[PDB]
Enzyme design. Structure first.
Site, PDB file in Angstrom:
ATOM      1  N   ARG A 103      -7.224  -1.840   2.608  1.00 26.63           N
ATOM      2  CA  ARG A 103      -6.754  -2.818   3.547  1.00 26.63           C
ATOM      3  C   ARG A 103      -5.416  -2.481   4.208  1.00 26.63           C
ATOM      4  NH1 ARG A 103      -6.588  -8.063   0.080  1.00 26.63           N
ATOM      5  NH2 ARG A 103      -6.584  -6.685  -1.746  1.00 26.63           N
ATOM      6  N   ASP A 156      -1.167   3.835   6.186  1.00 26.52           N
ATOM      7  CA  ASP A 156       0.072   3.078   6.233  1.00 26.52           C
ATOM      8  C   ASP A 156       1.172   3.893   5.487  1.00 26.52           C
ATOM      9  OD1 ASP A 156      -1.524   2.799   3.964  1.00 26.52           O
ATOM     10  OD2 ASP A 156      -0.632   0.894   3.371  1.00 26.52           O
ATOM     11  N   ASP A 181       1.715   9.010  -0.398  1.00 29.54           N
ATOM     12  CA  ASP A 181       2.656   9.434  -1.417  1.00 29.54           C
ATOM     13  C   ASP A 181       1.972  10.544  -2.187  1.00 29.54           C
ATOM     14  OD1 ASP A 181       0.925   7.616  -2.980  1.00 29.54           O
ATOM     15  OD2 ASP A 181       2.348   6.055  -2.362  1.00 29.54           O
ATOM     16  N   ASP A 240       1.241  -4.235   0.405  1.00 29.92           N
ATOM     17  CA  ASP A 240       1.464  -5.366  -0.477  1.00 29.92           C
ATOM     18  C   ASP A 240       2.049  -4.921  -1.804  1.00 29.92           C
ATOM     19  OD1 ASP A 240      -1.181  -4.142  -1.356  1.00 29.92           O
ATOM     20  OD2 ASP A 240      -0.909  -5.716  -2.869  1.00 29.92           O
ATOM     21  N   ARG A 270       2.147  -8.498   2.477  1.00 27.11           N
ATOM     22  CA  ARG A 270       1.288  -7.724   3.363  1.00 27.11           C
ATOM     23  C   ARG A 270       1.444  -8.127   4.847  1.00 27.11           C
ATOM     24  NH1 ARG A 270      -2.822  -4.558   1.346  1.00 27.11           N
ATOM     25  NH2 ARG A 270      -3.424  -5.812  -0.463  1.00 27.11           N
TER      26      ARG A 270
HETATM   27 MG    MG Z   1      -3.527   3.302   2.359  1.00 27.95          MG
END
Ligand code: MG
Length: 163
Positions: free
Chosen positions: A41, A89, A92, A148, A154
């Site tokens: 999401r 988004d 890492d 989130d 979020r």
């Molecule tokens: Mg992601």
């Protein structure tokens, strides 16, 4: 704990407009069909803002992934022979992203790249190629703009730091 603004809404906006001009220049002359693919999401907000700044005709699609990386929801669109830009988004570890990239690779898209809003290079466990990065950050506890922390923040319009 508390949340402070780290990357203000207006900075995200100015940066997205640049990513958009940049993506537009890179793909403008391909001619092939283009598809922007988000990973749900987390990517929904970045995708919404980014696609409106990409001045090249394209479709928007989403997929859900997540031990083996499994597809909980595959793409609705076909990508064979198309330019594909995965929209994340934050990156890492890069583990999931690299498996997704391989999975999509088997479909023989004309091209495949990644654009992430946030990059946390110090956490990379696998090395996956990333063509566009919004902001490179230290290993901070971030939330907002689609990210989130236990189902909340979020919806914040800025990237914040959990204190
Ligand atoms: Mg992601």
């Amino acid at each position: 704990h508390t949340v402070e603004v780290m990357i203000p809404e207006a900075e995200i906006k100015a940066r997205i407009a640049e990513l958009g001009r940049q993506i537009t220049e890179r793909y403008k002359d391909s001619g092939s069909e283009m598809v922007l693919v988000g990973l749900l999401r987390g990517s929904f907000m970045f995708m919404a803002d980014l696609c409106r700044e990409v001045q090249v005709p394209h479709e928007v699609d989403f997929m859900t992934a997540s031990r083996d990386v499994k597809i909980l929801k595959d793409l609705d669109e076909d990508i064979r022979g198309k330019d594909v830009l995965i929209v994340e988004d934050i990156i890492d570890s890069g583990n999931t992203l690299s498996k997704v990239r391989e999975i999509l690779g088997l479909r023989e898209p004309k091209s495949l790249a990644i654009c992430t809003l946030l990059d946390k290079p110090s956490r990379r466990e696998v090395d996956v190629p990333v063509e566009f990065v919004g902001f490179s950050i230290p290993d901070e506890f971030v939330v907002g703009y689609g990210i989130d922390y236990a189902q909340r923040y979020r919806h914040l319009p800025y990237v914040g730091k959990v204190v």
